[PDB]
Amino acid sequence: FPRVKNWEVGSITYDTLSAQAQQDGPCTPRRCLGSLVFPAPEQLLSQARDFINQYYSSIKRSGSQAHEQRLQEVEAEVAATGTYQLRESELVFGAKQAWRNAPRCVGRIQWGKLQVFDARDCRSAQEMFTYICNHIKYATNRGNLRSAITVFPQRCPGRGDFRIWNSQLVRYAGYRQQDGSVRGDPANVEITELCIQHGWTPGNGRFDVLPLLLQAPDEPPELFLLPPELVLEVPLEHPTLEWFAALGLRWYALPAVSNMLLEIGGLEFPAAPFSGWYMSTEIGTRNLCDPHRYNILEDVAVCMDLDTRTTSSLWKDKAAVEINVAVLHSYQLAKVTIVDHHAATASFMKHLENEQKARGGCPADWAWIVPPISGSLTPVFHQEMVNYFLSPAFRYQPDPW
Amino acid sequence: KFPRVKNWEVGSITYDTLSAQAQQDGPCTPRRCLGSLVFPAPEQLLSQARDFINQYYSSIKRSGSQAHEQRLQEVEAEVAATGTYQLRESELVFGAKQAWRNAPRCVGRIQWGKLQVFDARDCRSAQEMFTYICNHIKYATNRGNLRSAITVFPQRCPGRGDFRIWNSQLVRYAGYRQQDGSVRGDPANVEITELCIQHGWTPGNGRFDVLPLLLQAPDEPPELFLLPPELVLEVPLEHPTLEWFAALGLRWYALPAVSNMLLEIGGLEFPAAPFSGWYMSTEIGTRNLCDPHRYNILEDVAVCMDLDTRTTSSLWKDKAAVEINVAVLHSYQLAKVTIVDHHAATASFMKHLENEQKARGGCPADWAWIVPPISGSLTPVFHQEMVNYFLSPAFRYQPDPW
Ligand code: HEM
Ligand code: HEM
Ligand SMILES: Cc1cc(N)nc2cc(-c3ccc(OC(C)C)c(CN)c3)ccc12
Ligand SMILES: Cc1cc(N)nc2cc(-c3ccc(OC(C)C)c(CN)c3)ccc12
Ligand SMILES: Cc1cc(N)nc2cc(-c3ccc(OC(C)C)c(CN)c3)ccc12
Ligand SMILES: C[C@H](O)[C@H](O)[C@H]1CNc2nc(N)[nH]c(=O)c2N1
Ligand SMILES: [Cl-]
Ligand SMILES: [Cl-]
Ligand SMILES: [Gd]
Ligand SMILES: [Gd]
Ligand SMILES: [Zn+2]
Numbered sequence: 001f002p003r004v005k006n007w008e009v010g011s012i013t014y015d016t017l018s019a020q021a022q023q024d025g026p027c028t029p030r031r032c033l034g035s036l037v038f039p040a041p042e043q044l045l046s047q048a049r050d051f052i053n054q055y056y057s058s059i060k061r062s063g064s065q066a067h068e069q070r071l072q073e074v075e076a077e078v079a080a081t082g083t084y085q086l087r088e089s090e091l092v093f094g095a096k097q098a099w100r101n102a103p104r105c106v107g108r109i110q111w112g113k114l115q116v117f118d119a120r121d122c123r124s125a126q127e128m129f130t131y132i133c134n135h136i137k138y139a140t141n142r143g144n145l146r147s148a149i150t151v152f153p154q155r156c157p158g159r160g161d162f163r164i165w166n167s168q169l170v171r172y173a174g175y176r177q178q179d180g181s182v183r184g185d186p187a188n189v190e191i192t193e194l195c196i197q198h199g200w201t202p203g204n205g206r207f208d209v210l211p212l213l214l215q216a217p218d219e220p221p222e223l224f225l226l227p228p229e230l231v232l233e234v235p236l237e238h239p240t241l242e243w244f245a246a247l248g249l250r251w252y253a254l255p256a257v258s259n260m261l262l263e264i265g266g267l268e269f270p271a272a273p274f275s276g277w278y279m280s281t282e283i284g285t286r287n288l289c290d291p292h293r294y295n296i297l298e299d300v301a302v303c304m305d306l307d308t309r310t311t312s313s314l315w316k317d318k319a320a321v322e323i324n325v326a327v328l329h330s331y332q333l334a335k336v337t338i339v340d341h342h343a344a345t346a347s348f349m350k351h352l353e354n355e356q357k358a359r360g361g362c363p364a365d366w367a368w369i370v371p372p373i374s375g376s377l378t379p380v381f382h383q384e385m386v387n388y389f390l391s392p393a394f395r396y397q398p399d400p401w
Numbered sequence: 402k403f404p405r406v407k408n409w410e411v412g413s414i415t416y417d418t419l420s421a422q423a424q425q426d427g428p429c430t431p432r433r434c435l436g437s438l439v440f441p442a443p444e445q446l447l448s449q450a451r452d453f454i455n456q457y458y459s460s461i462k463r464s465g466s467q468a469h470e471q472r473l474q475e476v477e478a479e480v481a482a483t484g485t486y487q488l489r490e491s492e493l494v495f496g497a498k499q500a501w502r503n504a505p506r507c508v509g510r511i512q513w514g515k516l517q518v519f520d521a522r523d524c525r526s527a528q529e530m531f532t533y534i535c536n537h538i539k540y541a542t543n544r545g546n547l548r549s550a551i552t553v554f555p556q557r558c559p560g561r562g563d564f565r566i567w568n569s570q571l572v573r574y575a576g577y578r579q580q581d582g583s584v585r586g587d588p589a590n591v592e593i594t595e596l597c598i599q600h601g602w603t604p605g606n607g608r609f610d611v612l613p614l615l616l617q618a619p620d621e622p623p624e625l626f627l628l629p630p631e632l633v634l635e636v637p638l639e640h641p642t643l644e645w646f647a648a649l650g651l652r653w654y655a656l657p658a659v660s661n662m663l664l665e666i667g668g669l670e671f672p673a674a675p676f677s678g679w680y681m682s683t684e685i686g687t688r689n690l691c692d693p694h695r696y697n698i699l700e701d702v703a704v705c706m707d708l709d710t711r712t713t714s715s716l717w718k719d720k721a722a723v724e725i726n727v728a729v730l731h732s733y734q735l736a737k738v739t740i741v742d743h744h745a746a747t748a749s750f751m752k753h754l755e756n757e758q759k760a761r762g763g764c765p766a767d768w769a770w771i772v773p774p775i776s777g778s779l780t781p782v783f784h785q786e787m788v789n790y791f792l793s794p795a796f797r798y799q800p801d802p803w
Contacts, residue, residue: 002428002433002435002438004438005439007439007694008692008693008694015433018432018433021432021433022432024431024432025431025432025433025434026431026434027429027430027431027434027436028429028430028431029426029427029428029429029430030420030421030423030426030427030790031404031417031420031423031427031429031788031789031790032427032429032434032436032788032789032790033404033788034429034434034436034437034768034789035436035768035769035786035787035788035789036404036406036407036786037407037409037786285778285779286778289778289779290410290778290784291410292409292410292411292784297779311742311744311745311748312682312730312734312742312744312745313727314723314726314727314730314742314744314776316744316776316779317723317726317775317776317779318723320776320779321716321719321720321723324716324719325715325716328714328716332714340713340714340716342713342716342718343713343714346713366436366437366769367768367769370769370777372777372778372783373719373775373776373777373778373779374716374718374719374722374775374776375772375773375774375775375777376687376688376691376692376774376775377687377691377699377718377719377722377775381774382692384437384438384439385437386433386434386435387433387434387436388432388433388434
């Protein structure tokens with residue numbers, strides 16, 4: 001039982017929940033790979049028995065009652081048909097628990113408040129597209145953002161999968177030219193290539209909202225242009241640097257990830273887009289300052305009249321800080337839910353303590369919980385953490401080409 | 402089947418084949434990662450001795466030599482007669498450099514080849530020990546143009562106690578606990594400050610009182626030694642535009658000289674081998690000055706900057722922290738004391754990684770420690786995957802002697 005210390009307060013705790021991790025991670029006694037970004041159907045049933053067993057413990061009702069009853073229904077269902085279906089409340093419970101188990105997610109204090117949209121009755125691309133549009137609309141809620149997941153039909157043995165091709169529902173275009181240089185977001189250059197290749201008309205410049213590429217079983221994907229009024233955007237302005245607005249920067253309101261596989265009780269949902277709200281360093285630091293994303297840091301520094309000649313003026317640090325001030329300020333002015341990295345990390349500490357009392361620990365990936373700016377100014381920096389895999393879980397999955 | 406490490410900023414891929422040589426075992430298992438933990442006979446003394454000799458003779462492109470095989474037989478014959486063996490002077494110089502080269506949390510390893518190695522294996526008393534240390538400090542400081550050095554005191558041997566330096570660094574500021582339950586000076590050094598006083602040191606009452614050295618000879622109580630004031634170079638901290646900053650009375654010392662780690666070379670152990678380089682400015686500005694459990698000046702800085710303390714979303718902590726680091730860099734450059742900022746440091750560490758991959762097929766690096774504690778993703782090391790493992794020779798932590 002790993003002894004875990006907080007070096008700011010001197011507290012000690014023991015992670016007993018780690019003793020129930022299963023699906024092996026990438027590390028060995030010889031070497032740690034914790035910094036890596038990507039590390040006979042009989043086993044379907046054993047994964048079902050354990051998932052159901054914590055469901056009934058979670059509602060006290062383990063032993064007696066329909067706890068016993070529900071074990072046979074799945075026993076018999078897999079025996080006849082190979083797969084099984086989850087009850088609606090189980091699917092709600094599995095969604096929340098996989099969020100609760102995401103080691104790299106700093107917003108998990110919120111894991112109990114999740115709206116689950118059951119789309120297992122789906123059978124078309126246009127049927128997915130309307131389901132996605134209800135998600136975005138409900139989740140955006142005019143800027144008072146609400147966590148949401150939409151779950152599409154579970155993969156069946158034989159016959160294909162539902163699968164969104166965009167990494168997120170809202171992503172900006174990436175265009176090349178002669179120079180190999182990119183106009184727009186370089187992270188989304190390939191998916192933009194696959195959008196033109198499927199009959200999309202390209203666009204003006206930096207911030208062209210990509211059309212969705214949705215793929216029902218077998219028959220290939222089809223474009224679906226997003227309606228401009230439901231893709232909510234925030235134009236970036238700075239509270240005191242008057243010239244910042246004229247840089248024409250924007251970002252969208254809703255981070256909505258659409259390329260991960262949800263696993264509950266042994267079933268795989270390759271299309272199950274979830275969404276919440278942004279922590280501001282994701283926008284200001286990673287999306288806009290990363291050298292391989294929009295890469296704006298130098299431009300903001302020239303406007304601030306900073307000494308770009310020598311690294312020891314910390315012009316990069318001054319300019320990054322003001323970009324984040326502009327992100328927070330613009331989202332608030334537009335009344336869109338956003339959280340700063342200090343508030344978010346302070347809440348995650350609170351979640352660590354709750355999770356101690358409840359389950360005896362919490363899988364947490366230190367490199368991803370610590371913010372990408374001002375790391376040691378946040379309480380999670382000085383907090384040792386244990387990373388391991390629990391189920392239910394969100395998992396990465398190969399892209400479909 | 403060697404780990405594939407990717408650089409995400411540019412798209413590089415290499416495989417760490419050096420990790421397959423990791424002749425120790427860390428705290429991670431397939432079932433859980435413990436990478437963020439701060440703290441993770443003759444037959445085997447022989448196998449480590451043989452491995453180090455093999456290394457040394459490969460580095461002088463003399464592997465498999467008669468001189469190589471002779472040296473193996475000599476060490477095997479010496480652990481037979483005495484249970485231990487002695488390093489040659491050149492093997493000791495090589496081994497200290499390798500230990501620096503192999504330290505996974507050190508971002509300054511680009512410099513690993515330029516290390517001045519003082520052999521103090523003939524040291525006999527705490528008094529001589531003080532003399533070797535003073536000369537280490539004088540050489541390393543070099544009037545502000547700082548040089549990398551290590552002094553090696555006698556190895557651990559059976560039938561005699563260890564040379565130990567009780568202080569964690571050669572230069573540290575006292576920390577006096579108060580009636581408020583508070584601490585004047587550096588809170589991290591409250592323990593050593595009590596130890597010094599209970600071994601007969603007259604305390605001060607400032608926030609930057611340099612602590613005496615507690616120096617333990619074999620089988621002796623620790624002996625207290627006060628450093629000549631003119632040996633400890635100090636940098637008063639001022640800000641290039643914020644003039645009230647100078648009136649905080651902040652200072653820091655020039656020379657980071659770690660003195661409580663164990664140096665291990667081919668199975669031999671050197672529990673007293675203090676080493677020193679130069680500071681990266683974030684160690685001073687972000688950690689030593691802004692950590693809540695250290696000097697904790699951040700709120701006081703931000704209040705004076707007229708920032709909005711009542712809410713986190715003003716990013717008052719980030720802004721105050723960046724100006725404290727500006728003050729550190731400017732103060733050290735004003736005083737002509739060597740210093741490196743985290744952008745220069747991480748850029749050169751990337752060159753180190755490239756140099757190391759060509760030479761040994763990899764490099765042990767601890768991502769959570771290589772990434773600076775501010776502005777992480779503004780540096781190239783943030784986007785570089787790394788593999789953490791333990792190669793030997795090596796610096797290791799060891800328990801406090803008390
Ligand atoms: C409501 C506020 C939320 C915030 C502030 C938040 C924040 C974050 C952040 C900052 C990351 C790091 C990714 C990166 O920086 O590249 C992350 C990853 C992640 N988040 Fe959250 N998130 C929120 C809601 C949710 C919801 C509703 C879910 C699932 C239903 C979720 C699941 C995940 C997953 C699965 C990952 C990556 C998984 C992993 O690698 O462990 N988050 N989140
Ligand atoms: C010349 C300039 C040097 C710089 C800029 C530098 C930088 C650093 C930094 C920033 C740390 C971590 C501090 C922290 O985490 O708060 C570190 C750790 C360390 N450094 Fe260096 N260092 C230098 C020289 C040296 C030398 C000369 C040696 C030994 C001969 C050395 C050996 C180590 C070791 C053993 C650690 C701890 C590593 C571990 O625990 O795995 N460094 N260094
Ligand atoms: C619900 C949610 C809210 C939020 N506020 N943020 C989120 C960030 C990610 C996420 C996951 C992986 C990932 O990276 C993969 C390429 C490994 C990235 C960007 N790197 C973001 C996923 C979900 C998020
Ligand atoms: C030669 C040198 C130069 C420098 N510029 N910096 C250095 C920092 C450390 C060091 C080592 C460990 C450590 O922490 C514990 C694991 C003991 C800390 C503070 N976190 C600093 C050690 C040596 C350093
Ligand atoms: C998770 C983490 C990352 C990092 N990058 N650094 C860290 C440094 C410390 C830490 C805390 C106290 C401490 O020292 C006590 C003996 C006062 C030392 C060593 N001096 C290190 C603890 C955790 C750290
Ligand atoms: C190499 C390194 O592991 C990689 O760049 C990681 C580091 N930590 C991260 N943390 C978050 N939240 N998001 C990221 O994309 C990354 N990138
Ligand atoms: Cl994003
Ligand atoms: Cl220090
Ligand atoms: Gd101007
Ligand atoms: Gd001024
Ligand atoms: Zn690990």
